[PDB]
Design a protein around this ligand. Sequence first.
Ligand SMILES: *[C@@H]1O[C@H](CO)[C@@H](O[C@@H]2O[C@H](CO)[C@@H](O[C@@H]3O[C@H](CO[C@H]4O[C@H](CO[C@H]5O[C@H](CO)[C@@H](O)[C@H](O)[C@@H]5O)[C@@H](O)[C@H](O[C@H]5O[C@H](CO)[C@@H](O)[C@H](O)[C@@H]5O)[C@@H]4O)[C@@H](O)[C@H](O[C@H]4O[C@H](CO)[C@@H](O)[C@H](O)[C@@H]4O)[C@@H]3O)[C@H](O)[C@H]2NC(C)=O)[C@H](O)[C@H]1NC(C)=O
Ligand SMILES: *[C@@H]1O[C@H](CO)[C@@H](O[C@@H]2O[C@H](CO)[C@@H](O[C@@H]3O[C@H](CO[C@H]4O[C@H](CO)[C@@H](O)[C@H](O)[C@@H]4O)[C@@H](O)[C@H](O[C@H]4O[C@H](CO)[C@@H](O)[C@H](O)[C@@H]4O[C@H]4O[C@H](CO)[C@@H](O)[C@H](O)[C@@H]4O)[C@@H]3O)[C@H](O)[C@H]2NC(C)=O)[C@H](O)[C@H]1NC(C)=O
Ligand SMILES: *[C@@H]1O[C@H](CO)[C@@H](O[C@@H]2O[C@H](CO)[C@@H](O[C@@H]3O[C@H](CO[C@H]4O[C@H](CO)[C@@H](O)[C@H](O)[C@@H]4O)[C@@H](O)[C@H](O[C@H]4O[C@H](CO)[C@@H](O)[C@H](O)[C@@H]4O)[C@@H]3O)[C@H](O)[C@H]2NC(C)=O)[C@H](O)[C@H]1NC(C)=O
Ligand SMILES: *[C@@H]1O[C@H](CO)[C@@H](O[C@@H]2O[C@H](CO)[C@@H](O[C@@H]3O[C@H](CO[C@H]4O[C@H](CO)[C@@H](O)[C@H](O)[C@@H]4O)[C@@H](O)[C@H](O[C@H]4O[C@H](CO)[C@@H](O)[C@H](O)[C@@H]4O)[C@@H]3O)[C@H](O)[C@H]2NC(C)=O)[C@H](O)[C@H]1NC(C)=O
Ligand SMILES: *[C@@H]1O[C@H](CO)[C@@H](O[C@@H]2O[C@H](CO)[C@@H](O[C@@H]3O[C@H](CO[C@H]4O[C@H](CO)[C@@H](O)[C@H](O)[C@@H]4O)[C@@H](O)[C@H](O)[C@@H]3O)[C@H](O)[C@H]2NC(C)=O)[C@H](O)[C@H]1NC(C)=O
Ligand SMILES: *[C@@H]1O[C@H](CO)[C@@H](O[C@@H]2O[C@H](CO)[C@@H](O[C@@H]3O[C@H](CO)[C@@H](O)[C@H](O)[C@@H]3O)[C@H](O)[C@H]2NC(C)=O)[C@H](O)[C@H]1NC(C)=O
Ligand SMILES: *[C@@H]1O[C@H](CO)[C@@H](O[C@@H]2O[C@H](CO)[C@@H](O)[C@H](O)[C@H]2NC(C)=O)[C@H](O)[C@H]1NC(C)=O
Ligand SMILES: *[C@@H]1O[C@H](CO)[C@@H](O)[C@H](O)[C@H]1NC(C)=O
Ligand SMILES: *[C@@H]1O[C@H](CO)[C@@H](O)[C@H](O)[C@H]1NC(C)=O
Ligand SMILES: *[C@@H]1O[C@H](CO)[C@@H](O)[C@H](O)[C@H]1NC(C)=O
Ligand SMILES: *[C@@H]1O[C@H](CO)[C@@H](O)[C@H](O)[C@H]1NC(C)=O
Ligand SMILES: *[C@@H]1O[C@H](CO)[C@@H](O)[C@H](O)[C@H]1NC(C)=O
Ligand SMILES: *[C@@H]1O[C@H](CO)[C@@H](O)[C@H](O)[C@H]1NC(C)=O
Ligand SMILES: *[C@@H]1O[C@H](CO)[C@@H](O)[C@H](O)[C@H]1NC(C)=O
Ligand SMILES: *[C@@H]1O[C@H](CO)[C@@H](O)[C@H](O)[C@H]1NC(C)=O
Ligand SMILES: *[C@@H]1O[C@H](CO)[C@@H](O)[C@H](O)[C@H]1NC(C)=O
Ligand SMILES: *[C@@H]1O[C@H](CO)[C@@H](O)[C@H](O)[C@H]1NC(C)=O
Ligand SMILES: *[C@@H]1O[C@H](CO)[C@@H](O)[C@H](O)[C@H]1NC(C)=O
Ligand SMILES: *[C@@H]1O[C@H](CO)[C@@H](O)[C@H](O)[C@H]1NC(C)=O
Ligand SMILES: *[C@@H]1O[C@H](CO)[C@@H](O)[C@H](O)[C@H]1NC(C)=O
Lengths: 222, 126, 449, 53, 41
Amino acid sequence: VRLSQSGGQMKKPGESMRLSCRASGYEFLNCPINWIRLAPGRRPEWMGWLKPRGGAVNYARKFQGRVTMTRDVYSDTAFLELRSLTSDDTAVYFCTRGKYCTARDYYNWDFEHWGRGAPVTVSVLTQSPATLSLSPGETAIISCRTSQSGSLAWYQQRPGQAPRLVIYSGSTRAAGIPDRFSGSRWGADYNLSISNLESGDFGVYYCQQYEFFGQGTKVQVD
Amino acid sequence: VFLGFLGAAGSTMGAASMTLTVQARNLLSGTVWGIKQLQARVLAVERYLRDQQLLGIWGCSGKLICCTNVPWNSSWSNRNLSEIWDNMTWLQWDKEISNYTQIIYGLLEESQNQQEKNEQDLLALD
Amino acid sequence: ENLWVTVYYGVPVWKDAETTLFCASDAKAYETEKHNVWATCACVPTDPNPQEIHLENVTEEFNMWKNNMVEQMHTDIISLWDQSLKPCVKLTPLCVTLQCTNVTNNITDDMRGELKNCSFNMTTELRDKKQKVYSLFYRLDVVQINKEYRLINCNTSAITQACPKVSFEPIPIHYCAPAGFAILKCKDKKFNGTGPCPSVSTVQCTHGIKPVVSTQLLLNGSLAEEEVMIRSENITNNAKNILVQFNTPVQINCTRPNNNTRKSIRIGPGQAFYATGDIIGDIRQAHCNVSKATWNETLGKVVKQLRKHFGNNTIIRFANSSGGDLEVTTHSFNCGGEFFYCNTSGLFNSTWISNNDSITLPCRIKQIINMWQRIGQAMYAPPIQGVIRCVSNITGLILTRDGGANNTSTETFRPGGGDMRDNWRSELYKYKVVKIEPLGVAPTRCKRR
Amino acid sequence: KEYRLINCNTSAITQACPKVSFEPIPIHYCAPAGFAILKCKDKKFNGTGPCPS
Amino acid sequence: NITDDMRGELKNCSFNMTTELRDKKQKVYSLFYRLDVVQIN
Ligand SMILES: *[C@@H]1O[C@H](CO)[C@@H](O[C@@H]2O[C@H](CO)[C@@H](O[C@@H]3O[C@H](CO[C@H]4O[C@H](CO[C@H]5O[C@H](CO)[C@@H](O)[C@H](O)[C@@H]5O)[C@@H](O)[C@H](O[C@H]5O[C@H](CO)[C@@H](O)[C@H](O)[C@@H]5O)[C@@H]4O)[C@@H](O)[C@H](O[C@H]4O[C@H](CO)[C@@H](O)[C@H](O)[C@@H]4O)[C@@H]3O)[C@H](O)[C@H]2NC(C)=O)[C@H](O)[C@H]1NC(C)=O
Ligand SMILES: *[C@@H]1O[C@H](CO)[C@@H](O[C@@H]2O[C@H](CO)[C@@H](O[C@@H]3O[C@H](CO[C@H]4O[C@H](CO)[C@@H](O)[C@H](O)[C@@H]4O)[C@@H](O)[C@H](O[C@H]4O[C@H](CO)[C@@H](O)[C@H](O)[C@@H]4O[C@H]4O[C@H](CO)[C@@H](O)[C@H](O)[C@@H]4O)[C@@H]3O)[C@H](O)[C@H]2NC(C)=O)[C@H](O)[C@H]1NC(C)=O
Ligand SMILES: *[C@@H]1O[C@H](CO)[C@@H](O[C@@H]2O[C@H](CO)[C@@H](O[C@@H]3O[C@H](CO[C@H]4O[C@H](CO)[C@@H](O)[C@H](O)[C@@H]4O)[C@@H](O)[C@H](O[C@H]4O[C@H](CO)[C@@H](O)[C@H](O)[C@@H]4O)[C@@H]3O)[C@H](O)[C@H]2NC(C)=O)[C@H](O)[C@H]1NC(C)=O
Ligand SMILES: *[C@@H]1O[C@H](CO)[C@@H](O[C@@H]2O[C@H](CO)[C@@H](O[C@@H]3O[C@H](CO[C@H]4O[C@H](CO)[C@@H](O)[C@H](O)[C@@H]4O)[C@@H](O)[C@H](O[C@H]4O[C@H](CO)[C@@H](O)[C@H](O)[C@@H]4O)[C@@H]3O)[C@H](O)[C@H]2NC(C)=O)[C@H](O)[C@H]1NC(C)=O
Ligand SMILES: *[C@@H]1O[C@H](CO)[C@@H](O[C@@H]2O[C@H](CO)[C@@H](O[C@@H]3O[C@H](CO[C@H]4O[C@H](CO)[C@@H](O)[C@H](O)[C@@H]4O)[C@@H](O)[C@H](O)[C@@H]3O)[C@H](O)[C@H]2NC(C)=O)[C@H](O)[C@H]1NC(C)=O
Ligand SMILES: *[C@@H]1O[C@H](CO)[C@@H](O[C@@H]2O[C@H](CO)[C@@H](O[C@@H]3O[C@H](CO)[C@@H](O)[C@H](O)[C@@H]3O)[C@H](O)[C@H]2NC(C)=O)[C@H](O)[C@H]1NC(C)=O
Ligand SMILES: *[C@@H]1O[C@H](CO)[C@@H](O[C@@H]2O[C@H](CO)[C@@H](O)[C@H](O)[C@H]2NC(C)=O)[C@H](O)[C@H]1NC(C)=O
Ligand SMILES: *[C@@H]1O[C@H](CO)[C@@H](O)[C@H](O)[C@H]1NC(C)=O
Ligand SMILES: *[C@@H]1O[C@H](CO)[C@@H](O)[C@H](O)[C@H]1NC(C)=O
Ligand SMILES: *[C@@H]1O[C@H](CO)[C@@H](O)[C@H](O)[C@H]1NC(C)=O
Ligand SMILES: *[C@@H]1O[C@H](CO)[C@@H](O)[C@H](O)[C@H]1NC(C)=O
Ligand SMILES: *[C@@H]1O[C@H](CO)[C@@H](O)[C@H](O)[C@H]1NC(C)=O
Ligand SMILES: *[C@@H]1O[C@H](CO)[C@@H](O)[C@H](O)[C@H]1NC(C)=O
Ligand SMILES: *[C@@H]1O[C@H](CO)[C@@H](O)[C@H](O)[C@H]1NC(C)=O
Ligand SMILES: *[C@@H]1O[C@H](CO)[C@@H](O)[C@H](O)[C@H]1NC(C)=O
Ligand SMILES: *[C@@H]1O[C@H](CO)[C@@H](O)[C@H](O)[C@H]1NC(C)=O
Ligand SMILES: *[C@@H]1O[C@H](CO)[C@@H](O)[C@H](O)[C@H]1NC(C)=O
Ligand SMILES: *[C@@H]1O[C@H](CO)[C@@H](O)[C@H](O)[C@H]1NC(C)=O
Ligand SMILES: *[C@@H]1O[C@H](CO)[C@@H](O)[C@H](O)[C@H]1NC(C)=O
Ligand SMILES: *[C@@H]1O[C@H](CO)[C@@H](O)[C@H](O)[C@H]1NC(C)=O
């Protein structure tokens, strides 16, 4: 499964922008594609999803009337348009696909596949701690408090790379995730524990419940 | 009383032992799209003869019920006579004994009618 | 005192499994003949006196979202569609240049034609002289190319014309299980379709389920008991569809005010194409009526059930589809052989707070379809003579909820669909397949010498 | 004078393969286990009703 | 670019083709191996 995105761009206020994302390696019609924007030091915002089967779509409230999502089933390419761009829209826009995606059913919100992202410049879930300075070998314990409950996920973003799904269902590791990563739960509280820190582990981590994301925790080497 | 097919499923094993002749009766029941039912009723009769073969090689042959000369091992969920037939359903019992069904089957087909019938072969010649 | 094993054959013991289900469709439906309509050809006649055994004291867990009968029915209808279209006339030499023009009518400029009067060449019975014949196609069926047009499916797949002998009329089909299996049925009045069921009964064959292929609006379905039912695999998940089942059916009337002519142009030898001749009468467009009062009471009864899951004092707003293909943005269905796509913007345009005529909807008609998101097989629906009128029951909806809310207490719902498996899940929620294991061993004080 | 095949605007046409033959060969029809075929062996059976032998 | 001992092997063939429509043809070219083609006079 590979999501190939078009590059980033610089727009002016008032203009409109259009992005594409070509999926490959699986049956495009099986499960929806999502569009999520990440602004530096800002809570990631889920914009909407599209079911390629019939082109069904679902837009976030904030974007209703401004965003238009379509797709080309023949070229397996998803298109998005955003009108009336304002400075608030500066962010890196990603197309995502969930992990579980078979013919029988799917689960949209475990985003295991991410595009490279498109930087566009125009000119609840309580996650703690904000930052975490630790040495290689120690253990990092990131916490996320919910209020709704439901399959929670943990993602890792390395400096300059697309986020990678690390954990889903609060306690289940994804493909390629070693035993060092582990999840736990107590009531509304969720804990991600990373033992024996190493260079690759450092970055920023996010907790997620459906379309809502945490504020993020930057784990850096000291 | 006749609860019907699968009637006493939630009843105790002692109570469900009265409905044996009901689930046994409806177990056999007498261009494409027409082979869909053919291959199904063929697997149906293969499942029937499979169970009849197991029921035959053991010390039963006569269906429904039969006794055997096998001591009940306490490791196979050590329960009491009145705690099985009057406090447990057949689904709940099979859920516990699922580990030892194949072992008992081996102690039934081999240890019995292979040594018992040969013993009769020695007892019937005199 | 020491117990002894005893083999019991015929015990009420079943386990969840998947098997090969066969069909059943009464005995009067076979008298419908007409060269095998839909499927009923070699289907087993339904038992005149079906038996439904209520399993007392039995509580069995169902799961409409992990049920294999839906996948089996889906693949069965797909194979049905292929077997029904294999021996029909293939329209391979029909992608010829179409010199189309407006239909004979009188303005305005907002009528946007819709109907195109195309003239073109055609191969006759002999392989020499051609044939300059004309037909009448819908705009959704043609596409211009640089007035010259072409069929919209030229660079997609092949095309085969549906035979006029068969029909697409959904007839009740009973799914039955072979010997050794059984179908469990939940008979509680409030089974919202997942988990343990208090009153479980066993059956050999399910009730007559008509395979009505439709989107957004569930037509000719089973009515719910007491209160209208709301079913979802994950309510907090806005990506999972929400199947709504009605208690009182909503009367809908759809008509095709364009009583048409069938021209039987001959693409011999043997094959024959059924084009659309001239229209006798007025140039009118198909439309659907929904009784305003019935729609109000149904919506007001549904929003009261929606407030039981998204908070008591919340605002529920209805909006129509956000966009995509015609099969998802419109109410797609079949009536009289024609494939309608109706505008459902007059039904989902409301805003409900915590506390006398008909609604007409513009319906389009398409002849070249590719349902079930199938590529490789395009079917040309032959024209149907006479005014087509049909009265159906709206018995349920397929809704989707908007996401990324966080802020605000209102929730917005839009019509969805696409996956035709959801259309089958609205009828197979109360059934599940189990396999019988009659061999059960149990200890008792019985032996021989 | 221009002609054509008489079956052009009727159906398709396939040529019979020269390998096979249309020679009527005796075919015995038999019944599976559990069934039987009754045969009337009277010299004057005009073919309907009870048969003596 | 040569020599004469390279014996081509690869042939750059141009030809007609039937398009989607049963009217205008299609002047397209392909590249076939010598074992796949054979000249005719
Ligand atoms: C169809 O309709 C039916 C109704 O007939 C319906 O069934 C009920 O559905 C409703 C939802 O509308 C249920 O109500 C909710 O159930 C939630 C799930 O509860 C389970 O999970 C709890 C969490 O377990 C994790 O956490 C603990 C502790 O950390 C952990 O140890 C476990 O390992 C697990 O990982 C679990 O505690 C809970 O157990 C309690 O509850 C059952 C009764 O539900 C009780 O018998 C036990 O003894 C135990 O006391 C259960 O196993 C639940 O999360 C949710 O909220 C509760 O929990 C949050 C947690 O903070 C609370 O804050 C909140 O106030 C709630 O108390 C809520 O209770 C209900 O569970 C269903 N009933 C059944 C029988 O399943 C369907 O949903 C309907 N379907 C559709 C499609 O509409
Ligand atoms: C949801 O459930 C409802 C409930 O049934 C269902 O409504 C049914 O709608 C269909 C239309 O789609 C109906 O079937 C057609 O009805 C018309 C009109 O009926 C009149 O005629 C009879 C004659 O006795 C009267 O008793 C009756 O009261 C009406 O006055 C019929 O004319 C149709 O007959 C032809 O069509 C069939 C299928 O095409 C053929 O199989 C049949 O043989 C007929 O064909 C012949 O006659 C044609 C007449 O011109 C001729 O042109 C043909 O070439 C051919 O020679 C047809 O029976 C039905 O009546 C409705 N049900 C009820 C109870 O009235 C919905 O359709 C359903 N929704 C979905 C999505 O399935
Ligand atoms: C869809 O579009 C197609 C064309 O693409 C249409 O089909 C054509 O319709 C026109 C009508 O507008 C037809 O024209 C008529 O042809 C008749 C055929 O007569 C033949 O034989 C006589 C000798 O008896 C010859 O003289 C003649 O040339 C033909 O060879 C004519 O008889 C008609 O003439 C009558 O009507 C005109 C109308 O002005 C009068 O002036 C005349 O005096 C006379 O009364 C007429 O010319 C045409 O033939 C059709 N073509 C085909 C291929 O069918 C559809 O009309 C159009 N549909 C819609 C809804 O727009
Ligand atoms: C929808 O569009 C279709 C288009 O085909 C219309 O169908 C035609 O309708 C007309 C009008 O009813 C029919 O014309 C009728 O013809 C009858 C005789 O037909 C027979 O005989 C001829 C030879 O003379 C044969 O060729 C033919 O095959 C038949 O065997 C006349 O007797 C009719 O007149 C009587 O009825 C009318 C009302 O219809 C009265 O006003 C008259 O006074 C008289 O009592 C009539 O002229 C034509 O046959 C139909 N064609 C077909 C193929 O069915 C539909 O009418 C139209 N429907 C609507 C609602 O718009
Ligand atoms: C063959 O049938 C196909 C149907 O299955 C047709 O494919 C679709 O055709 C429509 C238009 O008829 C396209 O919709 C348009 O898409 C463009 C996209 O613009 C971008 O891409 C073009 C091409 O690379 C580029 O030049 C532009 O600058 C853009 O970068 C939109 O701009 C339009 O508004 C309109 O939505 C579909 O995209 C297309 N589908 C696919 C999968 O390509 C096809 O046209 C038919 N071909 C012929 C010859 O008739
Ligand atoms: C046949 O075609 C004619 C010509 O278009 C049709 O007449 C048109 O009818 C419309 C509708 O009444 C007119 O639009 C009008 O525009 C004025 C602009 O101010 C507006 O005030 C009116 O309320 C109306 O919307 C249009 O002007 C008129 N065109 C002409 C040339 O008269 C006619 O209706 C068609 N049918 C028949 C049977 O004639
Ligand atoms: C669909 O059409 C039927 C038939 O015309 C309508 O039923 C009629 O309703 C009126 C008003 O209540 C009655 O006077 C008639 O007696 C009814 N006729 C029949 C045959 O039932 C029905 O109301 C229409 N529904 C919609 C939504 O248009
Ligand atoms: C969603 O459905 C799954 C499957 O039953 C269940 O495990 C999960 O708890 C559900 N999520 C919520 C938030 O109820
Ligand atoms: C019975 O089970 C026990 C413990 O599992 C074991 O020691 C013994 O060998 C078993 N005997 C038989 C006859 O199965
Ligand atoms: C009950 O089970 C125990 C433990 O195996 C045993 O000592 C006792 O004999 C059993 N009693 C009866 C009545 O079966
Ligand atoms: C089944 O056997 C496994 C493996 O020894 C064991 O973990 C489990 O407890 C057994 N279950 C029962 C019901 O005996
Ligand atoms: C109909 O005629 C008008 C006037 O020439 C033209 O603009 C239009 O494209 C034609 N077709 C349709 C569908 O309106
Ligand atoms: C077919 O279309 C062509 C368009 O070039 C036209 O010349 C011809 O008259 C039409 N009719 C026939 C029978 O060829
Ligand atoms: C719809 O019914 C509701 C509830 O009875 C209501 O408040 C409203 O006025 C009705 N709408 C119309 C148009 O009658
Ligand atoms: C919804 O209504 C709008 C008009 O407000 C229309 O543009 C759009 O096509 C409609 N969508 C559907 C799915 O009916
Ligand atoms: C559906 O109807 C609404 C209301 O009339 C209209 O605004 C919209 O454009 C229509 N949609 C289509 C696709 O025609
Ligand atoms: C929806 O209803 C409101 C209130 O009656 C109306 O103002 C609006 O125009 C309607 N929308 C459409 C597309 O008809
Ligand atoms: C559809 O609803 C009408 C209106 O009550 C009813 O007469 C008819 O029987 C219903 N059709 C069913 C339930 O199949
Ligand atoms: C290539 O060009 C030479 C020079 O004209 C010619 O002799 C030869 O036949 C051509 N083809 C091949 C395969 O060498
Ligand atoms: C096809 O081959 C012929 C050679 O006679 C040539 O004239 C023509 O240009 C070729 N291509 C087309 C599209 O006709």
